[PDB]
Amino acid sequence: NIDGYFKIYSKHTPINLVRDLPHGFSALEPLVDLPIGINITRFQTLLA
Amino acid sequence: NCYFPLQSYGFQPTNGVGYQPYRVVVLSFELLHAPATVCGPKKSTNLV
Ligand SMILES: *[C@@H]1O[C@H](CO)[C@@H](O)[C@H](O)[C@H]1NC(C)=O
């Protein structure tokens, strides 16, 4: 959340290797740029 | 001195100009305290 615009960047990567979290190179493309204008302090996440 | 505060407009097809019902919309807007999520159309031109 910067300059009153909120920005989601992301990558999807179908790593079939079973071990935890890989080391190796890739970069997030930008998904969404939103004029939401809100102050922010914290966040929470949703699980099924 | 006890009164109900509200009454109908007697709007009839025989009312004079100005005595008739007129429809009104007022465009307010608040500005620049957060990013401009509205603007009018910017025009476009042929790609020479
Ligand atoms: C964001 O935070 C600052 C500091 O508390 C405050 O001046 C500003 O009015 C806040 N914005 C909103 C939308 O509340």
UniProtKB/Swiss-Prot annotation, chain A:
Changing residue 20 to G: In strain: Beta/B.1.351. Changing residue 27 to V: In strain: 20A.EU1. Glycans are attached at residue 39. Binds to host ACE2. RBD also interacts with the N-linked glycan on 'Asn-90' of ACE2. Cleavage of S generates a polybasic C-terminal sequence on S1 that binds to host Neuropilin-1 (NRP1) and Neuropilin-2 (NRP2) receptors. Interacts with host integrin alpha-5/beta-1 (ITGA5:ITGB1) and with ACE2 in complex with integrin alpha-5/beta-1 (ITGA5:ITGB1). May interact via cytoplasmic c-terminus with M protein. May interact (via N-terminus) with host bilirubin and biliverdin, thereby preventing antibody binding to the SARS-CoV-2 spike NTD via an allosteric mechanism. Attaches the virion to the cell membrane by interacting with host receptor, initiating the infection. The major receptor is host ACE2. When S2/S2' has been cleaved, binding to the receptor triggers direct fusion at the cell membrane. When S2/S2' has not been cleaved, binding to the receptor results in internalization of the virus by endocytosis using host TFRC and GRM2 and leading to fusion of the virion membrane with the host endosomal membrane. Alternatively, may use NRP1/NRP2 and integrin as entry receptors. This is Spike protein S1. It comes from Severe acute respiratory syndrome coronavirus 2. The chain holds residues 196 to 243 of 1273 of the full protein.
